Design a protein around this ligand. Sequence first.
Ligand SMILES: N[C@@H](CCC(=O)N[C@@H](CS)C(=O)NCC(=O)O)C(=O)O
Ligand SMILES: N[C@@H](CCC(=O)N[C@@H](CS)C(=O)NCC(=O)O)C(=O)O
Ligand SMILES: N[C@@H](CCC(=O)N[C@@H](CS)C(=O)NCC(=O)O)C(=O)O
Ligand SMILES: N[C@@H](CCC(=O)N[C@@H](CS)C(=O)NCC(=O)O)C(=O)O
Ligand SMILES: [Cl-]
Lengths: 203, 203
Amino acid sequence: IDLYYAPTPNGYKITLFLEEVGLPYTIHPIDISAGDQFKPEFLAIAPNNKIPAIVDHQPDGGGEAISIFESGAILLYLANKTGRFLSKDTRERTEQLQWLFWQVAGFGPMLGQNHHFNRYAPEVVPYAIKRYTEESQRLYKVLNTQLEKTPYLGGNEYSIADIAVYPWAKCYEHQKINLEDYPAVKKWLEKIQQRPATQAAYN
Amino acid sequence: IDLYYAPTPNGYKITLFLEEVGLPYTIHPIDISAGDQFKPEFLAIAPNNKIPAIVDHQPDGGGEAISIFESGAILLYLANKTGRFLSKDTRERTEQLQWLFWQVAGFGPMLGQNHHFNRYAPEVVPYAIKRYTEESQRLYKVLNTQLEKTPYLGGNEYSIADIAVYPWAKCYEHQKINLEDYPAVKKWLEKIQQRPATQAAYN
Ligand SMILES: N[C@@H](CCC(=O)N[C@@H](CS)C(=O)NCC(=O)O)C(=O)O
Ligand SMILES: N[C@@H](CCC(=O)N[C@@H](CS)C(=O)NCC(=O)O)C(=O)O
Ligand SMILES: N[C@@H](CCC(=O)N[C@@H](CS)C(=O)NCC(=O)O)C(=O)O
Ligand SMILES: N[C@@H](CCC(=O)N[C@@H](CS)C(=O)NCC(=O)O)C(=O)O
Ligand SMILES: [Cl-]
């Protein structure tokens, strides 16, 4: 597995997964501050100009390498290939995938806008900062509400849903989120932080 | 299938799919202007307070009903259940799913911010409107570039990737997008508009 990577929340999703399974991989660093993500060779693999992306040179089918962009798609592909971190039971699987989709469609995109507008003086973008601050709070509340019910996000076991959420939730301080308002999220963060693969990916 | 629905881009994704397959469904209208999405009975099904959501009372397993929120998760679940609009070949499937994820994580979320900031006088939110206008252009360019290469989004056949994108791309005028800049997108919109299920869902 070739992983096109930068040390960002979306990059860490994939190294978390790979470190949990112990699947060999080669990191191809993409310097997103340098614009490496716009180079033609990268766009061939990842036409949306974003990391992460992978190339699997040993697809189950044999044959041509398979390239994939979108962290959610990569997680699903790898979970299917390895049979790890995603249930094969339709009910459990569907719950896990619902929360994966919730992460890629809402948690990541909106917290990312929160990150973006924190690059401005607040007085300069008052409507935007209010919008994304309030939405960040709503998202953490949704997350906390689920984690009050189940030990992991939509289930009894660590899954790709949790792997997708963790690198974003780990950044709560940058999002100006008061984690004391979300005690179940706090305990879940603490729990995932103790996993050796988490420490390895963030080393 | 019970579908919790409003006539919005994300709602139409699901009625497009159901109309293509001819799977019976019951619409449960959720008046999102009235705040129906915050009612406890709805939150039980869709804790993120958004439509669409479904309840499948006849899951393959038999047994308890399965509830699902997130349009991407619903599309995947229904495509798997029916065996329609998503390939069973690993390569084709992976390409389709990559583009599904791209839609739910980027195309929808960012065009939705474009929609939101068009509710303001432009002089009042100059940074936000510029950001989401430029991002909308980037997204249409990515879409157009792919549709120059393949007749449908990541493939030779209409799939859940196309179904996910269409209701958002159909709204280009509202996004202040000049569709003449994206001729492949224009032809693809025209093509999908001719499908009887498209007309049915939008009737
Ligand atoms: N929806 C995408 C988001 C990926 C993303 O936002 N990547 C960022 C770094 S975390 C990136 O490559 N930005 C480069 C750019 O926008 O030019 C995913 O889940 O993979
Ligand atoms: N072009 C991007 C560059 C910054 C970026 O890529 N941010 C990433 C996180 S490193 C993001 O918000 N991704 C959103 C997501 O994951 O959906 C922007 O202006 O926001
Ligand atoms: N990522 C979600 C987005 C769903 C969404 O944005 N739904 C809107 C209508 S299109 C909604 O229910 N808004 C209600 C609210 O935000 O209160 C999906 O793909 O299903
Ligand atoms: N609370 C939402 C209400 C509007 C809404 O739900 N917009 C939908 C479209 S109807 C949206 O942008 N969804 C984003 C997505 O599909 O990811 C907001 O303030 O933006
Ligand atoms: Cl699957």
